[PDB]
C-alpha cells in the first residue's frame, strides 16, 4: 500500500515545506523540496540508500521520489513523524532536569558517533548542517538527527571520499571558524567531522541553558544571539567567530552544578580554533555516558 | 490532498541482470516500471541524477514519470517509472516485422532525432548528453511509427556499454576520456550498427534479410571484449552490405550513411545533426 494523504503543513521556508501526512494509517513526515534545493534532495536520497544508516538517533527513512509531467518536477522525502517537533521548538517552552538534559545530549552524541564511524556496510558520514532545528525530539526523551542533504561520505577500506555535488553551505550561525574563513581542507574527511563537532558544542550550549540548577535557568537563545544582528550574514558570523574570537558565554551559575560544570568543559573542547584539538564524537559519547 | 502512489504490476515484459521491467497501471494509465537489481543500483542513481538536473522532454526520448526509492526490512527498492510502449523494443519488433521505405526512414530518422536532442547543448535549455549504450534493445517502437531512445543509466552530461556495440576506440582503450565529443562519437558508431539492423529488414525488389545482430557472422553469442577487439580493431571488419541494397536508392543512401558512422578515426564520423539532414533528403 503506497498512497499518502497530506493533512497539515508543519513547516515552510526556503527549503520547501514539510507536511504531516498519513500512510497505512500512521503519521509520516513528507518534505517537498524547493527546486532551488534539488541537489539536497538527491544527496539525501544517496545517503538513505544505505540500509546500515538506520539508527534510533537518525531520522528514519520511508521513501524518496522524484515525479514529473511536462516541465514540472516534484521532489519528495517521506520519513518517520515526530509530533514533539525539533529540539529548537522544544527548548523554547520547556526547561530540563539533569536526567532529561543528559538523555537529550547523549542521544545526539550517539547519533553523531553513529554517522561519523564507518561500519564494514555504512561509510563514515559527516553531516555538515548540525543544529537544533535539524534534531527532532522523540516521546522516549531521546532525539534523532535529520537532514542529510549536505552530508560527506568516506570509506577507509577503499580510500574513497564522496563530497557530493551540492553548493549549499551550512547554516551560517553554526559554521565553524575554518568554514567562515574558508580555510577548511576540502579533500580531508576529518575536516568535515570537526565541523560537526563545533556545531555539536553549540547545540550542547543551547540545551544546557535550559537545564535548571539551584532554581535558576536561562531563557532559550540561539548561539551568538548577543553579538550578531538578527538574521546574521556569513560576514557577520565571520566577524564574531574568526575576527573577535567569540565563543558562547558560560553562565556563572553553571559552576555551582557538577553536571553543568562537566558540560561547560565538554562544549569548550568542541570550540578550539584548531580543528584537530576538538574532541571526537566517540569521546563526547563516552564522556556523556560517564556524566550524571 | 490524496497522493495516489499505488502502481498495479500486471505483466513482466523483461528480466535480466539489470532487474525486471513490468507493464503496470496507475490511475487507469499504462506505465512501465523498471525494478533494479542490487547489481545495477548505480544505473538508477545516474538516470535519476540526470533527470534531477534536466527534465528531458522529447518525442524520441522515453518519457520519464518517476524515480522511486522505498525502504524495505533488509534492502532498498529502486524503481524507474516511464511511459509504456506496448509494441516493445526495436530489437523485438524487427524479429518478425519487415519494413517499407517510408517505415524504415521514419524509424531511423526518429532515432537520429532523439540522439541529436541528447547530444546538443541548449543555453538558457540542457547540457549535452551522450547515451553510451545505444542498441536496438534500448529503442522502443511507438504506435505512430516513430521510436524513442531508452536507458540513460550510463549517460554522461557536459556497468560498461554492450560489448557487441562498442566502438573501436573503446575496445582498444584509445578513447580520449577527457573529451566529451569522444562519447558522442561512440554513440554514432552504435547508431550506425542500429541503422544496419533496421535496413536489413526493409524489403526491396521482393528481397529482405533475416534479423541478425551486428557481427553475428564473426563473433559468438555474448562475445568477449577480446572477441570484439580482434574483429573491430585488429581486422577492422564492418557489417556486410548485401548486393541487393545497391538496386534500391534508399538502401544505397543508408549504406553510405552507415559507412560514415563506422570510420576507425572517431573525428571522421558524421554528427547526429548531419545524419538527420541526410535522412531528410532521402526519397
Ligand atoms: C508524475 O506523473 C504524473 C503526475 C500527474 C499530476 C497529478 N497531480 C497534479 C499534477 C500537477 C498539477 C499542477 C502543477 C503545476 C501547475 C502550474 N503551476 C501552478 C505549478 C504547479 C504540477 C503538477 C500532476 C502533473 C498526472 C499524471 O498523469 C496525468 C502523471 O503521469 C503519470
Ligand atoms: C529537519 O528536517 C526534517 C524534519 C522533519 C520532521 C519530522 N517530524 C516532525 C517534524 C515537525 C513536526 C511538528 C513541528 C511543530 C510545528 C509547529 N509547532 C512548533 C509545533 C509542531 C515541528 C517539526 C518535522 C519538521 C521531516 C523531514 O523530512 C521529511 C525533515 O527533513 C529531512
Ligand atoms: C510521491 O510519489 C508519487 C507521487 C505521485 C503523484 C500522485 N498524485 C499527485 C502528485 C502531485 C503532483 C504535483 C503536485 C504539485 C501541485 C502544484 N503545487 C504548486 C506543487 C505540487 C502535487 C501532487 C504526484 C507527484 C505519483 C507517483 O507515481 C506515479 C509517485 O510515486 C513515484
Ligand atoms: C529498454 O529499457 C526500458 C524499456 C521499458 C519499456 C517501456 N515500454 C514498453 C516495454 C515493453 C513492453 C512490452 C514488451 C513485449 C510484451 C508483450 N508483447 C506480446 C511483446 C512485447 C516488451 C517491452 C519496455 C520494456 C521501460 C524502461 O524503464 C521503465 C526501460 O529502461 C529504461
Swiss-Prot record, chain B:
It is found in: Membrane. The keyword Secreted does not apply. Changing residue 125 to R: In FOP; variant phenotype. One of its GO terms (biological process) is determination of left/right symmetry. It is a single-pass type I membrane protein. Residues 7-283 form the Protein kinase domain. The active site is at residue 133. GO terms for cellular component: activin receptor complex; apical part of cell; BMP receptor complex; plasma membrane. It catalyses: L-threonyl-[receptor-protein] + ATP = O-phospho-L-threonyl-[receptor-protein] + ADP + H(+); L-seryl-[receptor-protein] + ATP = O-phospho-L-seryl-[receptor-protein] + ADP + H(+). Changing residue 125 to E: In FOP; variant phenotype. GO terms for molecular function: activin binding; activin receptor activity, type I; ATP binding; BMP receptor activity; cadherin binding; metal ion binding; peptide hormone binding; protein homodimerization activity. ATP binds at residues 13-21, 34. Residues 1-283 are cytoplasmic. Its EC number is 2.7.11.30. Keywords: ATP-binding, Disease variant, Glycoprotein, Kinase, Magnesium, Manganese, Membrane, Metal-binding, Nucleotide-binding, Phosphoprotein, Receptor, Serine/threonine-protein kinase, Signal, Transferase, Transmembrane, Transmembrane helix. Its main location: membrane. The keyword Transmembrane helix applies. Its cofactor is Mg(2+); Mn(2+). Expressed in normal parenchymal cells, endothelial cells, fibroblasts and tumor-derived epithelial cells. It is linked to Fibrodysplasia ossificans progressiva: A rare autosomal dominant connective tissue disorder resulting in skeletal malformations and progressive extraskeletal ossification. Heterotopic ossification begins in childhood and can be induced by trauma or may occur without warning. Bone formation is episodic and progressive, leading to a debilitating ankylosis of all major joints of the axial and appendicular skeleton, rendering movement impossible. Interacts with FKBP1A. Interacts with FCHO1. Interacts with CLU. Interacts with type II receptors AMHR2 and ACVR2A. Interacts with BMP7. Interacts with GDF2/BMP9. Interacts with BMP6 (when glycosylated); the interaction may induce HAMP expression. Interacts with TSC22D1/TSC-22. Bone morphogenetic protein (BMP) type I receptor that is involved in a wide variety of biological processes, including bone, heart, cartilage, nervous, and reproductive system development and regulation. As a type I receptor, forms heterotetrameric receptor complexes with the type II receptors AMHR2, ACVR2A or ACVR2B. Upon binding of ligands such as BMP7 or GDF2/BMP9 to the heteromeric complexes, type II receptors transphosphorylate ACVR1 intracellular domain. In turn, ACVR1 kinase domain is activated and subsequently phosphorylates SMAD1/5/8 proteins that transduce the signal. Belongs to the protein kinase superfamily. TKL Ser/Thr protein kinase family. TGFB receptor subfamily. This is Activin receptor type-1. It comes from Homo sapiens. The gene is ACVR1. The chain holds residues 202 to 499 of 509 of the full protein.
Amino acid at each position: 500500500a503506497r498512497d499518502i494523504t497530506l493533512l497539515e503543513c508543519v513547516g515552510k521556508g526556503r527549503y520547501g515545506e514539510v507536511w504531516r501526512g498519513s500512510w497505512q494509517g500512521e503519521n509520516v513526515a513528507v518534505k517537498i523540496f524547493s527546486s532551488r534545493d534539488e541537489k539536497s534532495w538527491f544527496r539525501e536520497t544517496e545517503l538513505y540508500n544505505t540500509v546500515m544508516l538506520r539508527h534510533e538517533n537518525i531520522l528514519g527513512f520511508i521513501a524518496s521520489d522524484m515525479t514529473s509531467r511536462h516541465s514540472s518536477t516534484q521532489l519528495w522525502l517521506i520519513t518517520h513523524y515526530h509530533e514533539m517537533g525539533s529540539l529548537y521548538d522544544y527548548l523554547q517552552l520547556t526547561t530540563l532536569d539533569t536526567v532529561s538534559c543528559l538523555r537529550i545530549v547523549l542521544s545526539i552524541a550517539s547519533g553523531l558517533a553513529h554517522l561519523h564511524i564507518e561500519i564494514f556496510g555504512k561509510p563514515a558520514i559527516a553531516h555538515r548542517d548540525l543544529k537544533s532545528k535539524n534534531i527532532l525530539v522523540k516521546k522516549n526523551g531521546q532525539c534523532c538527527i535529520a537532514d542529510l542533504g549536505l552530508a560527506v561520505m568516506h570509506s577507509q577500506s577503499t580510500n574513497q571520499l564522496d563530497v557530493g555535488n551540492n553548493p549549499r553551505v551550512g547554516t551560517k550561525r553554526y559554521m565553524a571558524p575554518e568554514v567562515l574563513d574558508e580555510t577548511i581542507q576540502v579533500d580531508c574527511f576529518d575536516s568535515y567531522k570537526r565541523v560537526d563537532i563545533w556545531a555539536f558544542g553549540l547545540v550542547l550550549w543551547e540545551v544546557a541553558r535550559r537545564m535548571v540548577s539551584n532554581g535558576i535557568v536561562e531563557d532559550y537563545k540561539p548561539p551568538f544571539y548577543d553579538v550578531v544582528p538578527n538574521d546574521p550574514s556569513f560576514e557577520d558570523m565571520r566577524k564574531v567567530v574568526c575576527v573577535d574570537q567569540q565563543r558562547p558565554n558560560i553562565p556563572n551559575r553553571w559552576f555551582s552544578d557538577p553536571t553543568l560544570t562537566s558540560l561547560a568543559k565538554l562544549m569548550k573542547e568542541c570550540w578550539y580554533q584548531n580543528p584537530s584539538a576538538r574532541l571526537t564524537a566517540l569521546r563526547i559519547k563516552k564522556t556523556l555516558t560517564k556524566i550524571d
